[PDB]
Symmetry: D2
Subunit: 265 residues, 4 copies
């Protein structure tokens, strides 16, 4: 039933989801599949924890929010650390089964896109790649139309008297957040008196930690791709490494990094 080790974990279903396509079977295809499936499981947990962080923020539950963010950091760290396994996959080995993948690519990862949206990097154009899946497409639209984790943090600050612009109370959440210079003084005050604003200070650093770890994931991702396919165009239709290098330019919480330039000045 569900009380046995295997039944509780639904291993019959979990361990029958590895189906290589190369023929004859290529030894390194199992790594390729498992590498992605373990990542998808972590992404599922990450989304589970991040959704809870949003709820805690909405309810002004600071320590609870920090607790779930701490676990979120550990999950992102595992996702980043595991690239080391995939780096044992050489070009010689990969070219032995890359053709079986067809046009598929990471662009079609619904969970990854969900997390990107939740963190704030929204792009309604991505909903298109999931047209074949209206159900999943609907789930992406939901987070797309709701305030991001960052925006909820701003709304939290607003509830406590911080000089947060009125637009953050209600606006087109489907639009990706744009750097807001008027928020600079808000964060300067926090960092200039950490003893008083220790709650806000703690959350600011947690978000910086989360974004930094995410960028590290993006960087290791890019470097792994570079050592596997080099500068070949991707199966998804992009330039490959070039496109992944541009992703490193994206920022989730720009004001948190920009405030550094004026702190203590």
């Amino acid at each position: 039933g569900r009380l046995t080790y295997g039944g509780y974990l639904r291993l019959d279903q979990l361990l029958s989801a590895q189906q290589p396509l190369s023929e004859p079977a290529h030894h390194d295809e199992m790594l390729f599949i498992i590498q992605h499936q373990t990542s998808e499981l972590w992404l599922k947990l990450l989304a589970h924890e991040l959704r809870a962080a949003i709820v805690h923020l909405q309810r002004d539950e600071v320590w609870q929010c920090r607790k779930v963010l701490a676990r979120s950091k550990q999950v992102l760290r595992q996702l980043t650390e595991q690239w080391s396994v995939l780096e044992t996959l050489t070009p010689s080995e990969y070219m032995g089964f890359r053709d079986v993948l067809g046009p598929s690519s990471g662009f079609q990862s619904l969970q990854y896109r969900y997390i990107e949206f939740l963190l704030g990097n929204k792009n309604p154009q991505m909903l298109q790649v999931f047209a074949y899946d209206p159900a999943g497409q609907a789930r992406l639209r939901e987070v797309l139309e709701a305030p991001s984790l960052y925006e909820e943090f701003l709304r939290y600050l607003a509830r406590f008297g911080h000089a947060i612009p009125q637009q953050y109370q209600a606006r087109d959440w489907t639009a990706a957040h744009v750097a807001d210079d008027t928020l600079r003084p808000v964060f300067e005050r926090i960092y200039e008196n950490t003893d008083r604003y220790w709650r806000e200070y703690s959350l600011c650093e947690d978000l910086v930690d989360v974004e930094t770890q995410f960028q590290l994931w993006r960087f290791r991702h890019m470097r792994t791709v570079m050592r596997v396919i080099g500068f070949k165009r991707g199966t998804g239709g992009s330039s490959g490494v070039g496109f992944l290098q541009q992703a490193l330019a994206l920022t989730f919480f720009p004001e948190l990094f920009d405030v550094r330039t004026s702190v203590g000045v």
Copy 2:
């Protein structure tokens, strides 16, 4: 299912994989998802580890040293992920766990077929373990195959025997179902290897790779135990996990450390 074209989710069978997380708590407990995912990610890594370890055995059977080392290198990395991920579960507190532990069954990873496969492959054979898998005839059979076949260590010893090393004749044929017992007659064999790395660089490298594999495995065992300790606190239970730290897969490789010393270097050192 994107216009007949293969998709990311289709290739990875995500509909099946992502529908395998079914918490039993009701109202659902926030921390049960971690409990499940922690186990499932580990089971996937263990499946890959078995896949790679079997390949390492095949390479040894073919005298393919660099290939064996490469597969073992990947194996070490997989074991490292299995070890590092305990940091996620360490964020589970007693306050959180007491909220859903009641709905769980009384079993642990001791019932993991894939894990047992790894233990068997590395050499920690235990015929009695086959009974706990009686419920599953199929899985029980595949486990019996590895049980009756030489372990990774024994294949390494057989490889050494094929190249002049003073490996005892008993390693050519015996009841492989019985766990390897420390053999002091292997000491001179490993001493010679470590005392002449210029000539035995292949054997030397494989010896260190096996020590790396066992060390990382022991680290996984320790982190496992320390995590269980901070969650439920402290044979059976934590005591059983403590005893597991005393088990060794390649005893002779560690024992030789105490007797190496012959200096066969040329002039100038």
Copy 3:
């Protein structure tokens, strides 16, 4: 010394720091540099760890919870580096070590004053250890200061006592030179904290931080032992390191795991 302007090397005193690596082997052995650097990098991290742990104590003495947690967070990261770096030394083989171990003295990190300071701060007090530092009156004195002062754990208990927790009166004044002994009367205190995290979130967070610190420290101890095992093989020696794994700094925090269970949650759970 760049035109009177401070330089990178001058600020960091690199001329002094980078002239502290003096191998004794002659002809010099390639692997002796690793042996030295492995120890020196650890000694530097240990110096920082003491610096941070002392600050954590001060914060507890000032009821400064978020500050204490921040310092402990850095402390965990330093301990993590000390633990992770064993991977470098694991690349030292018996074949390499036997080439220079003869020129070394008979001492180990057991003679590390900075390490002993950490053990003392965390609470593993041992007045007898002061004698091994008899050669150094100064260092022996600074070590005596921490020995005679409440440990990080005892300051945490004193902090709890200042806020209504049922902490025994003996923790207000006693011979701090004596290592803390498991106190079962502390069980109800930690049970209440873990059973009402909404009210005792500060205490709850500090409890988990201390468990993190001890767990990471035990991991350092385990990696230390496993590395020594693969280098020299297996009280004293490896047996001593094995016994060190049985020591606990905050026993009551781990013991409470076995008795927590009161559900004080509101409706709906």
Copy 4:
């Protein structure tokens, strides 16, 4: 003497090299100093191991070269991993003692420059920053005028019949290596028959590992700087993060990554 724990390790000298300058003493200055000193010790070991790798390559000692490179990878990993400690240093804390540093900066790290030169990223213009130190400047010139680790690998391949250009037998080593398209076929052959060229294949992957880990160090370095000083100009006179982001564009073994694009095609 030198037989005691402290005497052997010269701790009296090592543990008296931490001298903060802030007045009053700033708590976080010790971290700043130790963070760099531990890194410098690892860099010293890294140089020690890399020099040995070069010697092994010159003597065609493959497994020995791989052994030292393996340790080199572990050292680079520690150097990269330790950034996590420094990330606990917030802008608020740093601004409390950054002023005491004056014009000093990582540009003045002789050991780091030495390693950069040894790996092949040579720039005679850096010798200038070390004018105040002629002795150390002389040590940098030595590695500057000698073949890099990569060039020695090419010379190794040349000794075994690989189609290596004649210029690699003798040339102006002080000049940084420039991408050589004529090397593409050399590496393609290696990756196309790994069973035969397993020795060359192994070394190629070791170099890819080393460069990838080095780039990871550069990335974490840049991200840490971003969360500490943001986009402020550096004490060394550069744009700061902008300059460190450009460093990520540098490559040690370009042909090893470029070959990926044509492997199996």
